[PDB]
Amino acid sequence: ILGGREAEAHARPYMASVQLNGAHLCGGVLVAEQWVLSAAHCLEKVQVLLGAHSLSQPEPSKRLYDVLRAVPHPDSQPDTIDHDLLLLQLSEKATLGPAVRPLPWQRVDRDVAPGTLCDVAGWGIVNHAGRRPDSLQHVLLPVLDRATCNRRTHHDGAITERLMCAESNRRDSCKGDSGGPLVCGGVLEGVVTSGSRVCGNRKKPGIYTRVASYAAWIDSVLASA
């Protein structure tokens, strides 16, 4: 997260860190008792850290789960950010409590109002040098209408109806925030894309996958256990 602030500890109990060999790689979002949603290129030794604020310090709520199965969206492709979703089935159902709870996710396939203030959280890089934070960061970002996001000087027609944008003027998602939650009105709306992109430039808005657009996919995979 560029231009953000340290989040309140445990105030986002749905927040996951998706890890490879005990190192943070992507954000994730607990969406069912045994399932974490993240982004497709995150998988390209997989564990999921729940109940955390600090990646390194002991916390009573923190628990690192093994992953039984990793299910990247079957239409996802290395060179694109289309269909950029990943579901991770934990080795067991997560132990729930005030610091570990799933997030309700949007099933109405219609756009949020332009300007809606959404929260994005993560352990991604925090400056141009690539500094990695030990504790969870967040930022409040206004949603940016699709027509502007698609203008020639911005993302030039790459924004489908299955993607949404937020403003990226100094406050932004960046590397390592991939897979994490864009939350609007207490509901999961988007997931941070995992394609490389310039961070913090107003002319290059943040891109997030619209979970409502993938409701059939998520329902099926969540039911496949």
Place of tokens 């203030």: 117
The nearest distance, CB 39 to ligand 8S5, in angstroms, is 6
The nearest distance, CB 11 to ligand 8S5, in angstroms, is 20
The nearest distance, CB 95 to ligand 8S5, in angstroms, is 26
Q: Taking Cα atoms as reference points, which of 120, 94, 136, 218 lies closest to residue 178?
A: 120
Q: Which of 10, 24, 41, 155 is catalytic?
A: 41
Binders of ligand 8S5 in range 32-61 (CB under 6 A): 39, 41-42
Q: Taking Cα atoms as reference points, which of 44, 209, 52, 59 lies closest to residue 133?
A: 52
178 included as an active-site residue: yes
Concatenating the DSSP letter of every residue in 28-83 gives: EEEEETTEEEE-GGGG--EEEEES-SBSSS--TT-EEEEEEEEEE-TT--TT--TT
**Residue 12 interacts with ligand 8S5 (CB under 6 A)?**
no
> Which listed range, 59-67, 90-98, 174-182, 212-220, lies at the site for ligand 8S5 (CB under 6 A)?
174-182
Q: Which of 84, 138, 168, 173 is catalytic?
A: 84
Q: State how far the Cα of 45 lies from the Cα of 23, in Å rounded to an integer.
A: 10
**Residue 25 interacts with ligand 8S5 (CB under 6 A)?**
yes
**Residue 124 interacts with ligand 8S5 (CB under 6 A)?**
yes
N-terminal to C-terminal alpha carbon distance within the chain: 34
Size of the site for ligand 8S5 (CB under 6 A): 21
79 included as an active-site residue: no
> Which listed range, 23-31, 69-77, 152-160, 212-220, lies at the site for ligand 8S5 (CB under 6 A)?
23-31
41 included as an active-site residue: yes
Q: Taking Cα atoms as reference points, which of 50, 94, 88, 41 lies closest to residue 224?
A: 88
- Pull the structure tokens for residue 99: 């610091």
The nearest distance, CB 189 to ligand 8S5, in angstroms, is 15
**Residue 174 interacts with ligand 8S5 (CB under 6 A)?**
yes
Q: Which of 173, 178, 194, 213 is catalytic?
A: 178
Strands 137-144 and 163-166: antiparallel
Q: State how far the Cα of 130 lies from the Cα of 168, in Å rounded to an integer.
A: 17
**Residue 175 interacts with ligand 8S5 (CB under 6 A)?**
yes
Position 148, amino acid: T
Residues that bind ligand 8S5 (CB under 6 A): 24-26, 39, 41-42, 123-125, 132, 173-176, 178, 192-194, 196-197, 199
